[PDB]
Structures are given as C-alpha cells and as structure tokens.
Structure 1
Amino acid sequence: MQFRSIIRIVGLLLALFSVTMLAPALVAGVPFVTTFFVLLFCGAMCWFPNRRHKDGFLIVVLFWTVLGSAGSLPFLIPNISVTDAFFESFSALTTTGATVILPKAILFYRQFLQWFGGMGIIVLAVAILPVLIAETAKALWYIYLSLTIACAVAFWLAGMTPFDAISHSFSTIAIGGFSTHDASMGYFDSYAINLITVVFLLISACNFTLHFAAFASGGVHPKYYWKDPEFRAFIFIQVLLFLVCFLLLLKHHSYTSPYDAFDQALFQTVSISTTAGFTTTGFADWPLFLPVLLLFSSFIGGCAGSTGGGMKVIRILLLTLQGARELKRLVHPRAVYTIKVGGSALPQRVVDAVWGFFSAYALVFVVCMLGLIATGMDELSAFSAVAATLNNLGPGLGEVALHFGDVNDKAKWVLIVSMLFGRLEIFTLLILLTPTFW
C-alpha cells in the first residue's frame, strides 16, 4: 500500500524530532546526541533508496506514535529498571506529574520537555481541519514570546537572579506541578510570585484561539466583553468557587489575617481546580469532602482551543442547556424546540455527535476504573489515582500513597497508556481496534 512514500516521510519525521535533541548538550549529554544520530541515520536510510512520493488517521497515530518513542534510551543506563525507566520517561513526558521518586542537565531537559509538550500540544490541535501552508508559526511565535518573557520578568520582580527566574519559568511552561523541591510552592513563597502566578494561571489556561485575531491590528478585543458565552459561564463557576472558599474559611475560621487566608486559600482552590497541578496542601484544615470535591473539580478541565483535552464548557453546556430543552420536551412532546444559545444556528448533527462522544467516553471511564482496579490495584488508592490519572494532575490524595513503584509494571504500562489517553484524543486507538476497520 504505497509503502515507498511512507518510509521516506516517516524517516524525515523521526529525523525532525531528533533535531530538537541537543538541549542537555548546552550544559556541559552524550546519549541524547546519540538518539539524534541514530534516528537521523534512520532518516538517512529511509531517504535515499526510495524517491517516490504519493490514511490520515494512520498519520495522526504515527504522529504520537513517534512522540512516545524516543526519550526512553538514556535512562536504562538515573539508574532504574527498564519498565520503571520507560514509565519515568513518560512521567517526564506529556506533562503528567507521575512521581515515583537528578543531574542539572537532565533536569533542564525535563523542564524543556514540558516546553516541547506545551508547544506541541497546541499546534496540531487546530490543524485537524483537512480531516475534520505553514504560516501560523510566526503568529504563534509572537504570542509565545509574550508569554515566556512575561513569565520570566514576573519571576524577576521578586529579586531572584535571572537564572533562577528562568528556571522557575521553564518549570511552569507546561505545568505538571513540578518545582525545584517536591512541595509545589511551599518551599519558596514570595508573595509577589504567588499573586502573579495565580494571575498567570487564570489568563494562560482558558482561551488563546479567540485572541488569534490579536495578530491582526483590527482591535476586536473590547467586543468580547459582551455576548461571550464562555465568559459568563466561566466567571459564574470561578466566582462561585471563590465564594465557597470564602464560606469554608468563615465556617472553620482558619486564618484571621486576609493575606494568608485569601492568597493561600485562593491559590490552593484555583490551582487544584484549574488542573494546574501545583498542590502543597494536605487538606487537613479543610474537611475530607473538600479533597473529594476538589477531585471532582479536577475532572472539569480545559477550555475550548486550550492546552488540555478534557470535558469542556460547550459539551457540558450543551447537555445542561440542551438538557433544559429536553426538560421542556418532558413537559410537552408536541412542542417544537429550537433554541440557539450561540449566535449561529446550531445543526443537529454536531450536538448528537458530541453527547455520543460523551457516552463512549463514559464507556472508556468504566474501562479505566474497572481495568486499573482489576489488574491488582487497591480499591481506594487506585480509585483516587484513576480520577487524578484521567485528569493528569498527579497521585491520588485520598488515603495517600503517592509514589507507586511497587505496582505491577505491565499495569504501569497501562497507566502510561491511560495518562496518554488523558492528553490525546482517546478514540484514536479505538479506530484501530474495530473489526469493521480491517
């Protein structure tokens, strides 16, 4: 099936991935250079005997097929077992805080991996239009420059030397919840960093596709204040979050001073809630239900045209508000229902497809919970772990045993696939399984 074209294109892809492998070498390192050489060699052998050129789902799978391989070689010789080495590689990879447990070059590379993951996750994410020319690089390069320079200067304000500010900035690009120390923000708590970082968390997560027009000099920004459905819904949930935090604070009478109670409390609620992953609280001053509630909050993750693939506003919104239309259906079946919350008329093909996706998603959820518990994992610690795993924050808080090294490595391989599913569209592998497809 035209294998000659596929070999050269795939080889070029592996070589291109390999070019971006000199990151630790800047910090005087050799295995990563070796990976570039081996894959480049692969590209070279693929490239020359075959010259001819010319499905798509196969390509997407091959895309993230690649991303998965690679990044596992320098760890078998960090002395850790091969399954654990692979698991750790994925742990560093995909911005998942999968801690079971370093060199200063490797650590820089790990934060760099977060950088690579962050840019990579949002580039083919709005490039699915042919299945459902490279000029977007510049406009993306400008927005990024604004994001990183702003973060670095913001860290600088505290007074740390630029290397430290840059180090923290690299750590927070694709937040997995990692920092210099295991405590996410407990080890260093300058007030300016906390306030500024929380602002970064709010601004950086929900929406950048909407502001793509910002590249054009039309000045369409003040229009978005009004009639933006996302803004009203999102503000209602977040403001409600603030009010409940305030109420909880008053009920327990935790901190009398405003600054610690508001910044620290707000920081914990926002950080855990926003799927950030920076957690430094054992939730003892909070009741037990707050960890459970927060975990449910963790499920709500990502925004439309955002870094994280999770349940979105429009999907839940459609179910609820469309659900309201269904409530109206319950009142009367003779009654035509057509309501358009959005400015456009909405076609009935997409809505049905979306909730169907949710139903299949539920099936996957059952598979993940049942499978992980089924493999030999404990009912509760794994239960919290699966909730956390699907979201991609970290270890399960309830009945804490954060580091699972002694769990079965084949299941660990399953954990890798599950977290990968957490980031990538889950049903790509699903298309592979079906018997009608063969």
Structure 2
Amino acid sequence: MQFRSIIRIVGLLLALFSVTMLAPALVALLYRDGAGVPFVTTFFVLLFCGAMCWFPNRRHKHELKSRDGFLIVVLFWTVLGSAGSLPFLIADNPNISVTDAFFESFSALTTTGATVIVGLDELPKAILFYRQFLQWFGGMGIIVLAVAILPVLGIGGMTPRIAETAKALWYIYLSLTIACAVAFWLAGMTPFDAISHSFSTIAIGGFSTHDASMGYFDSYAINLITVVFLLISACNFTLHFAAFASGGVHPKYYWKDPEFRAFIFIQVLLFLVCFLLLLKHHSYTSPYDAFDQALFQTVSISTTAGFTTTGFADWPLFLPVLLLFSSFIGGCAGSTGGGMKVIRILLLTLQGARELKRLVHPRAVYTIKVGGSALPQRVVDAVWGFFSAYALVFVVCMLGLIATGMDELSAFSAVAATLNNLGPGLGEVALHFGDVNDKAKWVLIVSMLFGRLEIFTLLILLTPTFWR
C-alpha cells in the first residue's frame, strides 16, 4: 500500500499549495482593501501542515503499483479542495458559511462553477481573485492529471519523465490564459476582470466577477472571444502539443483526429438546432442577437464551461433542457471539459451501432474502429461500463438530493450541473444553489468529485477488492 510515501506527497502538495495563497494576498495589498489577511493566515496555516506530513517522512517509494495512484488523485482533489475552504472560512469579511466555504471551494477547484456566495459583484478583489485562481489551478490539475492517469483508467487513448510532460502543458496553458486575458482586455475588461476571467475561461470553470457572469457587458466582442477559447481549450491538449512543438505544423494535425472532428460536428450541429429555433419562436427581435446568444450558450454549457449571458427569456423550454443534456458530452478527452468526454460518446454511438447490425447479420464480424480498430473485448467493455456507472451515480445522487430535502426536478438539475462539472441549473429556470438544503450541499460536493474523477477512480475506493 505504501501509505507513508503518499502522506509525503500530500505534505508536498499542501505546502506547494500554500505558496499560492500569496498571489491573492498580493492583491489585497495592491488592490484597495487591506482585508486579505485570511490568506496570509492560511499561508502559514497550511505551509505548516504540509511540512508535517512530509518531514516525519522523506521516503520516495516510486510508483507503488495500481492501488496507490488511485488513492493519490483522490487525495489530491480531496485535500487541496478542503484547504481551499480556508480563506473563505477565515476571511469572514465577504463572510460565508462553512459548508458554503467548502462548496464554493470544491466547486472553484474542480472547474465546476457553482456558487453559493451571491452579490459577489462588490467584494474584496483578493477574495474575488482567489475564486478565479482556484479554477485556473484546478484547470492545470486536470490536464497533467489526464496524462499521468492513463496508466490507470484512461486507457486506449514513469516517474522522472511525467514531469517533463506537464512542463510542456504549463506552456500551452500559460500561452492561452495570456493570449486570452490580453484579447479580453482589448475588449475593454478591466485588467483584473480580464485576468480573473481569462482564468476561469481556459479552465472551463465558469466563475465570474460580475454576479451575472458573462451578462457582464453586452459586448458581442467578449462573447466571441470566450466562445473561441472555450472551443480551443475544450479540445485536447495533446493535439495542441502537436501543433505547437513544431510551429506551423498545425493544419490537419487536428482535422485528422476523429475525436476532434466528432467534437466539431457536434458543436456546429448543436448551434444550428439552437440558433434556428430561436428564430422559429421569435425569441429576439434582431436575428443578430439570436446568433450571439445561441452560439455562446451551445458552447459554454455544451463544453461544461458554464458561462451564461441569457436568463433564457422567450427561449423555448426545449433549448435549455437540450442544453442540459449537452453537458453530458462536451470537452474532448485530455481537455478541461468534464462530461463523459467526446470519444466516450463517439465510441458509445459506434458500439451501439455495431449492436443493431449484429441483429441483421449475426454472422458477419464487425470490429469497432476509429482510424484503426478499438479493442472490442477490452476498451469497448470499459466505455459502456463507464456509461452505466455514470448513470448509476446520477440516479443515486438525484435520489439522495430528493431525500435530503430539495424537490424532484431541482435535484435533477443539480446533479446534472455538478456531475458534468457544468455549474448552473438550466432546467425550468430554478437555477440557484447557495440557499439549498445544507446536507444537499454535501451531496452536491461529493457529486462533483465523481465528475472530476470520471467515477471509477473514486468509485473503486468503495470496492472490497481494492482493500488488502
């Protein structure tokens, strides 16, 4: 099991985390205020803990088989998500509840995007920043996690070299959060509203400074930037490594990957169906606004990002509800997405197809292939075993949220907002957490843990056969 060597990397992360608490405090000094003291408390609070899991240790046992790696990523999200709830807890200045602080933290970390703190428009910019930061960080926590996770769950798609992997990611990540934040600034976003939004935009997070997210400034120019960098960020960073470990070698590098392709078909089709139905029901008086809102939504909520510019005014009930299911897809694998990713669908619809044909030609031998042949005994089994589970989780979560207190259709929209790391409600406009049954807030946090770990990795902790 090698518990020790684990607690050591926990102290490494705890400690490695504290060093972040400064960036927001740097802001409660620079920007106005003076009330970002709860970060400097947190900085010592956690800096201290870290080197107290790591000092009574110093024991690099490397790898340590399957049963360790699982336990690690669970802790990674488990712990650093709990820590995050400290500056909220402490800084009882934009004073929040405890479950609230936890929620607004885990949701911040997991690039989910679900808020319990309202009236954030006028807050301390050290606290406003901390919220966007955790998303930008968690955002990294995923891409490097979706490269050192393939050794386990993410198959069919080390110790001193996994490092020089992420190393590369940092750049793709950094290039984007700047390439964006600048483009956002030219849009006219205050520098702070350009760097705190370009944080939660690459991370498919969903957090905003403004209370009404991208309701923001009605600028088609901003809504055009976001939608672009969502599409980009929502598309698999190992394909970016391809376009940008060389330079102008980008072209067909993308159009050649089928998941990237499939994803593009889905985005065009989804927008089509959404944009056209905005015009059938005359939801806007200017077929331009139709274009604006339709295209933004089918992209932000499709990719499990979570940004919203509409209340869904005269929008046909259909469109949100359709958009609520969209979130079950969105985000190529190895992206910042979160629904059972693009391929898992792509595959699913192929593996299902094979099944109908296997009804007419029960002789012929088909083998599900993407460019060159999946593994119809093995990876095929993994996909539509994951699906089932995904649904089993969803059903238990909704059923536990319904017991917990809150109503039927809401539990529905809540788990759907959480499990796909989406953020908003989206059903029949009932979309606001925070003042939810408190027990329910926990069910919810434990729901977005499932969505981030793609179920198994954490589902397997309950197994009997994971314990020995």
TM-score by length of structure 2 reads 0.84
Deviations 1:246-284 (A, max 9, x none): 431332244454432322332233333232211132323
Q: Which moved more, 1:337-346 or 1:323-332?
A: 337-346
Give the CA deviation at 1:414.
1.5
Task: Report the CA distance between 1:218 and its aligned residue.
Answer: 7.4
Structure 2, unmatched stretches of 5+, are 28-34, 62-67, 118-122, 154-161
Separation of aligned partners in 1, 2:319 and 2:197: 29
Give, in angstroms, the shift of residue 290 of structure 1.
1.8
Distance 1:197 1:41, change over 3 A: closer
Deviates further, 371-380 or 256-265: 256-265
How much has 1:153 moved relative to structure 2? Answer: 2.3
Structure 1 range deviating more: 321-330 or 251-260: 251-260
**Alpha-carbon distance in structure 2 between the residues aligned to 1:386 and 1:432:** 21
- Percent identity of the aligned residues? 100
Distance, in Å, in 2 between the alignment partners of 1:314 and 1:118 is: 20
| Partner SS for 1:171 | helix
Q: Which one of the candidate residues 146, 168, 178 is aligned to 1:139? A: 168
Gaps of 5+ in 1: none
How far apart in 2 are the matches of 1:4 and 1:167?
Answer: 37
Deviation at residue 378 of structure 1 after TM alignment: 0.7
Q: For the Cα contact (< 8 Å) 2:213–2:309, is it kept in 1?
A: yes
1:167-223 CA deviation, whole Å, 9 max, x = no partner? 442353424333332222223122322223222222221232112123432754333
1:58 aligned to 2:71? yes
Change (3 A) 1:349 1:222: same
TM-aligned CA distance change 1:232 to 1:172, over 3 Å: closer
Cα contact 1:302–1:312 (8 A) shared by 2: yes
CA gap of 1:280–1:162, structure 2 versus 1, over 3 A, is closer
- Describe the shift of the 1:139–1:401 C-alpha distance in structure 2 as closer, same or farther (beyond 3 A): same
User: Are 1:272 and 1:294, in contact at CA under 8 Å, matched by a contact in 2?
Assistant: yes
SS at match of 2:108: helix
Q: Provide Cα deviations, 1:286-321, integer angstroms capped at 9, x if missing partner.
A: 211222212112222321221123222322222222
Is 1:100–1:402's contact at 8 Å kept on the other side of the alignment? Answer: no
Change (3 A) 1:80 1:152: closer
User: After the TM superposition, which of the residue ranges 102-111 and 201-210 deviates more from structure 2?
Assistant: 201-210
After TM superposition, give the deviation of residue 48 of structure 1 in Å: 4.5
- Whether the 8 Å CA contact 1:99–1:402 is kept in 2: the answer is no
When structure 1 is superposed on structure 2, of 219-228 and 293-302 the one drifting more is: 219-228
Question: Contact between 1:97 and 1:176, CA under 8 Å: does it hold in 2?
Answer: yes
Contact residue 267 and residue 298 of structure 2 kept, 8 A: no
Bigger drift between 387-396 and 46-55 goes to 46-55
Whether contact under 8 Å (2:329, 2:345) holds in the other structure is no
Q: Distance in 2 between matches of 1:181 and 1:286?
A: 23
| Closer, same or farther: CA 339–302 of 1 in aligned 2, 3 Å | closer
Return the offset for 1:104. Answer: 1.6
What is residue 71 of structure 1 aligned with on the other side? 84
Task: Give 1:49 deviation, angstroms.
Answer: 5.1
Distance in 2 between residues matched to 1:287 and 1:58, nearest whole Å: 45
Question: Cα–Cα, structure 1 residues 330 and 62, in superposed 2: closer, same or farther, change >3 Å?
Answer: same
Deviations 1:362-399 (A, max 9, x none): 22222112221122221122222222222222342334
Does the C-alpha gap of structure 1 residues 71 and 250 become closer, same or farther in structure 2, counting only changes over 3 Å?
closer
Q: Which has the larger radius of gyration?
A: 1
> Which range moves more in the overlay, 197-206 or 332-341?
332-341
Question: Structure 1: how far apart are the matches of 2:367 and 2:430?
Answer: 50
Question: Do 1:385 and 1:396's aligned partners in 2 also have CA atoms closer than 8 Å?
Answer: yes
Decide whether aligned partners of structure 1 residues 178 and 231 sit closer, same or farther in structure 2, where only a CA change above 3 A counts. Answer: closer
Provide, for residues 335-385 of structure 1, a one-character-per-residue CA deviation record: whole Å limited to 9, x for no partner. 222353323564521111221222222222221122211222211222222
- Offset, 1:130: 4.3
Q: Determine if contact 1:389/1:418 at 8 Å carries over to the other structure.
A: yes
Q: Using the alignment, how far apart are the partners of 1:232 and 1:48 within structure 2?
A: 49
CA distance, structure 2, for counterparts of residue 396 and residue 292 of structure 1: 10
- Aligned partners of 1:362 and 1:164: how far apart in 2? 37
Contact 2:339–2:421 (8 Å) recurs in 1: no
Distance 1:83 1:220 in 2: 48
Instruction: Give how far 1:71 is off.
Output: 1.8
Q: Which residue of 2 aligns with 1:417?
A: 446
**Greater helix fraction, Structure 1 or Structure 2:** 1
CA spacing shift, 1:332–1:211, aligned 2, 3 Å: same
Q: Does 1:157 align with 2:164?
A: no
Query: What corresponds to 1:238 in structure 2?
Result: 267
Query: Normalising by structure 1, what TM-score?
Result: 0.89
1:328 CA drift (Å): 1.4
